[PDB]
């Protein structure tokens, strides 16, 4: 459906991120935060992104 | 007694059939996050801590522990803890005084109510202040108990 589904939309170019209510810092409740999994992965993504673009 | 229930004599309960003790312990110790100055086992008063509970800390003593032999209700705290951080601008910023608490006290389990028995403290493997208490409860048979 051209208004909702396009094969060129089916390739990732610009990636949304979800707000912290999806991926909350658990606030580890002894002294620390222990901040969580999805945000770790997003930090990885942005690191590899800047590495690729500087290398390019 | 239909479907495996039982009728049980009250008088035998009163005399002491099937009575029982109950021993529970707790474990807590100071933690070092330093810049080696650790937590403390003190008695938190009102203008030292943040968001501390309503456990009515009166049962503790000057060294931050409870004494053996006293009774404890459900919500009484037994251990006093205080945050040694630094760096938090620990009594000069983002809090009033309310000195440096961020209180990490350990309340008793919310239901049972025993008597504190045989509290000891000794250092852990590496050397800290490391505390074990024990509380003792009588458990008379009631309706729902299972034999």
């Amino acid at each position: 459906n051209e208004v909702f589904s396009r094969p060129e939309w089916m390739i990732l170019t610009c990636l949304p991120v979800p707000p912290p209510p999806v991926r909350p810092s658990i606030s580890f409740n002894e002294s620390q935060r222990g901040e969580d999994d999805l945000t770790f992965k997003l930090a990885d993504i942005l690191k590899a992104n800047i590495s690729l673009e500087t290398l390019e | 007694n239909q479907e495996d229930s039982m009728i049980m004599n009250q008088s035998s309960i009163d005399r002491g059939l099937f009575r029982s003790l109950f021993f529970r312990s707790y474990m807590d110790q100071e933690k070092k996050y330093g810049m080696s100055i650790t937590e403390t086992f003190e008695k938190p008063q009102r203008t030292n801590t943040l968001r501390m509970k309503h456990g009515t800390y009166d049962k503790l003593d000057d060294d931050g522990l409870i004494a053996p032999g006293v009774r404890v209700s459900g919500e009484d705290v037994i251990i006093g803890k205080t945050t040694p951080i630094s760096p938090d601008e620990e009594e000069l910023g983002q809090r009033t005084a309310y000195h440096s608490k961020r209180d990490a006290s350990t309340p008793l389990r919310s239901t049972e109510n025993g008597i504190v028995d045989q509290v000891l403290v000794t250092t852990n493997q590496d050397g800290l202040k490391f505390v074990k208490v024990r509380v003792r409860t009588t458990k008379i048979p009631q309706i729902g108990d299972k034999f």
Partner: protein, 53 residues
């Protein structure tokens, strides 16, 4: 303190009791489970002889 035996077995003086009536079952308030004889298979009451058979 004072106390009575109704709310605790501390305050009892009773400690045991005994009770029996019609040891010969003339009133027929029971009949005996048995397999050959009621008379043979049950022991006589100790209070039998204070009333006639």
């Amino acid at each position: 303190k004072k106390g009575i035996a109704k709310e605790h077995a501390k305050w009892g003086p009773a400690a045991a009791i005994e009770f029996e009536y019609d040891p010969w079952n003339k009133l027929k308030h029971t009949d005996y489970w048995y397999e050959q004889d009621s008379a043979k298979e049950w022991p006589q009451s100790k209070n039998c002889e204070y009333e006639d058979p």
